[PDB]
Design a protein around this motif. Structure first.
Motif, PDB file in Angstrom:
ATOM      1  N   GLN A   1     -37.580 -61.487  91.595  1.00 35.16           N
ATOM      2  CA  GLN A   1     -36.911 -60.559  90.697  1.00 35.16           C
ATOM      3  C   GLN A   1     -37.868 -60.157  89.587  1.00 35.16           C
ATOM      4  N   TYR A   2     -37.609 -58.995  88.998  1.00 35.33           N
ATOM      5  CA  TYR A   2     -38.388 -58.531  87.863  1.00 35.33           C
ATOM      6  C   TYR A   2     -37.836 -59.114  86.565  1.00 35.33           C
ATOM      7  N   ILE A   3     -38.581 -58.901  85.479  1.00 35.81           N
ATOM      8  CA  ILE A   3     -38.165 -59.428  84.188  1.00 35.81           C
ATOM      9  C   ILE A   3     -36.974 -58.615  83.681  1.00 35.81           C
ATOM     10  CG2 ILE A   3     -39.047 -60.280  81.983  1.00 35.81           C
ATOM     11  CD1 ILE A   3     -40.539 -61.516  83.995  1.00 35.81           C
ATOM     12  N   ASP A   4     -36.321 -59.123  82.637  1.00 34.73           N
ATOM     13  CA  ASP A   4     -34.915 -58.807  82.412  1.00 34.73           C
ATOM     14  C   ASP A   4     -34.714 -57.694  81.388  1.00 34.73           C
ATOM     15  OD1 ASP A   4     -35.842 -60.335  80.294  1.00 34.73           O
ATOM     16  OD2 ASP A   4     -34.815 -62.145  80.987  1.00 34.73           O
ATOM     17  N   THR A   5     -35.801 -57.092  80.889  1.00 31.46           N
ATOM     18  CA  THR A   5     -35.688 -56.056  79.862  1.00 31.46           C
ATOM     19  C   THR A   5     -34.913 -56.610  78.677  1.00 31.46           C
ATOM     20  OG1 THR A   5     -33.620 -55.054  80.630  1.00 31.46           O
ATOM     21  CG2 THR A   5     -35.663 -54.285  81.638  1.00 31.46           C
ATOM     22  N   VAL A   6     -35.533 -57.536  77.941  1.00 32.94           N
ATOM     23  CA  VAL A   6     -34.821 -58.458  77.063  1.00 32.94           C
ATOM     24  C   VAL A   6     -33.837 -57.732  76.149  1.00 32.94           C
ATOM     25  CG1 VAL A   6     -36.381 -58.442  75.094  1.00 32.94           C
ATOM     26  CG2 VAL A   6     -35.232 -60.574  75.784  1.00 32.94           C
ATOM     27  N   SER A   7     -32.787 -58.453  75.762  1.00 31.73           N
ATOM     28  CA  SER A   7     -31.610 -57.892  75.109  1.00 31.73           C
ATOM     29  C   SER A   7     -31.862 -57.598  73.636  1.00 31.73           C
ATOM     30  CB  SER A   7     -30.424 -58.841  75.257  1.00 31.73           C
ATOM     31  OG  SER A   7     -29.205 -58.168  75.014  1.00 31.73           O
ATOM     32  N   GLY A   8     -30.787 -57.391  72.873  1.00 29.99           N
ATOM     33  CA  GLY A   8     -30.911 -56.936  71.503  1.00 29.99           C
ATOM     34  C   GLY A   8     -31.610 -57.925  70.589  1.00 29.99           C
ATOM     35  N   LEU A   9     -31.439 -57.696  69.286  1.00 31.72           N
ATOM     36  CA  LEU A   9     -32.189 -58.388  68.237  1.00 31.72           C
ATOM     37  C   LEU A   9     -32.411 -59.873  68.473  1.00 31.72           C
ATOM     38  CD1 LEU A   9     -33.438 -57.470  65.548  1.00 31.72           C
ATOM     39  CD2 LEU A   9     -31.984 -55.745  66.609  1.00 31.72           C
ATOM     40  N   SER A  10     -31.338 -60.635  68.652  1.00 35.44           N
ATOM     41  CA  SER A  10     -31.419 -62.087  68.603  1.00 35.44           C
ATOM     42  C   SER A  10     -31.971 -62.687  69.890  1.00 35.44           C
ATOM     43  CB  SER A  10     -30.045 -62.676  68.293  1.00 35.44           C
ATOM     44  OG  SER A  10     -29.034 -62.033  69.046  1.00 35.44           O
ATOM     45  N   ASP A  11     -32.685 -61.900  70.688  1.00 32.55           N
ATOM     46  CA  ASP A  11     -33.213 -62.392  71.951  1.00 32.55           C
ATOM     47  C   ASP A  11     -34.264 -63.470  71.724  1.00 32.55           C
ATOM     48  N   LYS A  12     -34.579 -64.195  72.799  1.00 36.04           N
ATOM     49  CA  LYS A  12     -35.444 -65.361  72.677  1.00 36.04           C
ATOM     50  C   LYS A  12     -36.880 -64.970  72.362  1.00 36.04           C
ATOM     51  N   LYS A  13     -37.265 -63.729  72.657  1.00 36.72           N
ATOM     52  CA  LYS A  13     -38.665 -63.347  72.495  1.00 36.72           C
ATOM     53  C   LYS A  13     -38.977 -62.975  71.053  1.00 36.72           C
ATOM     54  CE  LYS A  13     -39.431 -61.894  77.243  1.00 36.72           C
ATOM     55  NZ  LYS A  13     -39.599 -60.737  78.158  1.00 36.72           N
ATOM     56  N   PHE A  14     -37.967 -62.530  70.303  1.00 37.20           N
ATOM     57  CA  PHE A  14     -38.216 -62.082  68.937  1.00 37.20           C
ATOM     58  C   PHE A  14     -38.162 -63.237  67.946  1.00 37.20           C
ATOM     59  CE2 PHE A  14     -36.169 -57.916  70.396  1.00 37.20           C
ATOM     60  CZ  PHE A  14     -37.350 -57.539  70.987  1.00 37.20           C
ATOM     61  N   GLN A  15     -37.032 -63.942  67.878  1.00 37.82           N
ATOM     62  CA  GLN A  15     -36.855 -64.955  66.841  1.00 37.82           C
ATOM     63  C   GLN A  15     -37.892 -66.064  66.952  1.00 37.82           C
ATOM     64  OE1 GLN A  15     -33.395 -67.332  66.584  1.00 37.82           O
ATOM     65  NE2 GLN A  15     -33.631 -68.293  68.598  1.00 37.82           N
ATOM     66  N   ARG A  16     -38.723 -66.025  67.984  1.00 37.39           N
ATOM     67  CA  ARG A  16     -39.906 -66.869  68.039  1.00 37.39           C
ATOM     68  C   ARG A  16     -41.122 -65.968  67.899  1.00 37.39           C
ATOM     69  N   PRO A  17     -41.429 -65.510  66.684  1.00 35.94           N
ATOM     70  CA  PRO A  17     -42.496 -64.510  66.536  1.00 35.94           C
ATOM     71  C   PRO A  17     -43.883 -65.084  66.718  1.00 35.94           C
ATOM     72  CG  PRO A  17     -40.993 -64.595  64.624  1.00 35.94           C
ATOM     73  CD  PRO A  17     -40.828 -65.854  65.392  1.00 35.94           C
ATOM     74  N   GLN A  18     -43.992 -66.373  67.011  1.00 30.93           N
ATOM     75  CA  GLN A  18     -45.296 -66.939  67.328  1.00 30.93           C
ATOM     76  C   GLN A  18     -45.659 -66.583  68.759  1.00 30.93           C
ATOM     77  N   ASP A  19     -46.315 -65.440  68.932  1.00 29.41           N
ATOM     78  CA  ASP A  19     -46.618 -64.931  70.263  1.00 29.41           C
ATOM     79  C   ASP A  19     -47.593 -63.772  70.122  1.00 29.41           C
ATOM     80  OD1 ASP A  19     -44.823 -63.347  68.983  1.00 29.41           O
ATOM     81  OD2 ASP A  19     -43.217 -63.562  70.452  1.00 29.41           O
ATOM     82  N   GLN A  20     -48.508 -63.671  71.084  1.00 28.34           N
ATOM     83  CA  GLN A  20     -49.526 -62.631  71.042  1.00 28.34           C
ATOM     84  C   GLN A  20     -49.626 -61.924  72.387  1.00 28.34           C
ATOM     85  OE1 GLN A  20     -50.597 -62.170  67.995  1.00 28.34           O
ATOM     86  NE2 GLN A  20     -51.515 -60.237  68.662  1.00 28.34           N
ATOM     87  N   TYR A  21     -48.951 -62.462  73.400  1.00 29.15           N
ATOM     88  CA  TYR A  21     -48.710 -61.641  74.578  1.00 29.15           C
ATOM     89  C   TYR A  21     -47.238 -61.607  74.994  1.00 29.15           C
ATOM     90  N   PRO A  22     -46.289 -61.437  74.071  1.00 28.33           N
ATOM     91  CA  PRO A  22     -44.946 -61.048  74.458  1.00 28.33           C
ATOM     92  C   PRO A  22     -44.884 -59.539  74.528  1.00 28.33           C
ATOM     93  CG  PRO A  22     -44.943 -61.265  72.150  1.00 28.33           C
ATOM     94  CD  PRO A  22     -46.361 -61.545  72.600  1.00 28.33           C
ATOM     95  N   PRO A  23     -43.702 -58.953  74.599  1.00 23.15           N
ATOM     96  CA  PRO A  23     -43.580 -57.649  73.958  1.00 23.15           C
ATOM     97  C   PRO A  23     -44.134 -57.828  72.553  1.00 23.15           C
ATOM     98  CG  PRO A  23     -41.589 -58.108  75.173  1.00 23.15           C
ATOM     99  CD  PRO A  23     -42.498 -59.305  75.371  1.00 23.15           C
ATOM    100  N   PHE A  24     -45.323 -57.286  72.313  1.00 22.75           N
ATOM    101  CA  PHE A  24     -46.070 -57.567  71.095  1.00 22.75           C
ATOM    102  C   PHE A  24     -45.800 -56.566  69.996  1.00 22.75           C
ATOM    103  N   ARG A  25     -44.847 -55.673  70.207  1.00 24.16           N
ATOM    104  CA  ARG A  25     -44.593 -54.616  69.250  1.00 24.16           C
ATOM    105  C   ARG A  25     -43.428 -54.968  68.345  1.00 24.16           C
ATOM    106  N   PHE A  26     -43.545 -54.581  67.085  1.00 21.58           N
ATOM    107  CA  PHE A  26     -42.395 -54.513  66.200  1.00 21.58           C
ATOM    108  C   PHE A  26     -42.502 -53.269  65.326  1.00 21.58           C
ATOM    109  CE2 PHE A  26     -42.159 -59.154  67.079  1.00 21.58           C
ATOM    110  CZ  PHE A  26     -40.879 -59.174  67.573  1.00 21.58           C
ATOM    111  N   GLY A  27     -42.826 -52.131  65.948  1.00 24.01           N
ATOM    112  CA  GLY A  27     -43.451 -51.026  65.230  1.00 24.01           C
ATOM    113  C   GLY A  27     -42.867 -50.769  63.860  1.00 24.01           C
ATOM    114  N   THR A  28     -41.618 -50.310  63.806  1.00 28.14           N
ATOM    115  CA  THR A  28     -40.906 -50.216  62.539  1.00 28.14           C
ATOM    116  C   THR A  28     -41.675 -49.389  61.514  1.00 28.14           C
ATOM    117  OG1 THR A  28     -40.334 -52.483  63.078  1.00 28.14           O
ATOM    118  CG2 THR A  28     -39.418 -51.544  61.065  1.00 28.14           C
TER     119      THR A  28
END
Ligand SMILES: *[C@@H]1O[C@H](CO)[C@@H](O)[C@H](O)[C@H]1NC(C)=O
Lengths: 49, 50
Positions: free
Chosen positions: A1-28
């Motif tokens: 299966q492909y990756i899940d197109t992670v969900s809204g704000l409180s998803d697991k990839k964001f609230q752990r901002p210690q990462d340099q090859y996640p979705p690496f954007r927070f453009g804002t």
């Protein structure tokens, strides 16, 4: 299966901002309105934003 | 198993009406905007390694 197109704000990839090859954007876009909202309580984001 | 389902925080604990209840609470705020406490995490929250 492909990756899940992670969900809204409180998803697991964001609230752990210690990462340099996640979705690496927070453009804002600089000096925007939502620049302030990410300066409300949690310095977790504004540091990697 | 996924993500959290109930939010809360940590904190120091002091007997009610103790004198330091004010200065303590302060140096925590100062440490967030400073950047020390945030930079402390990596030293003990180090990499993933997996
Ligand atoms: C705590 O804060 C008060 C008010 O700013 C100050 O007078 C005092 O010197 C500080 N330190 C202690 C030990 O209370």
């Amino acid at each position: 299966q492909y990756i899940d197109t992670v969900s809204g704000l409180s998803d697991k990839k964001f609230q752990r901002p210690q990462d340099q090859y996640p979705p690496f954007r927070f453009g804002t876009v600089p000096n925007g309105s939502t620049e302030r909202n990410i300066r409300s309580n949690y310095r977790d984001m504004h540091t990697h934003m | 198993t996924g993500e959290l389902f109930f939010r809360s925080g940590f904190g120091i604990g002091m007997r009610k009406d103790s004198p330091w209840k004010q200065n303590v609470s302060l140096s925590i705020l100062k440490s967030h905007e400073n950047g020390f406490m945030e930079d402390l995490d990596k030293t003990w929250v180090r990499y993933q390694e997996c």
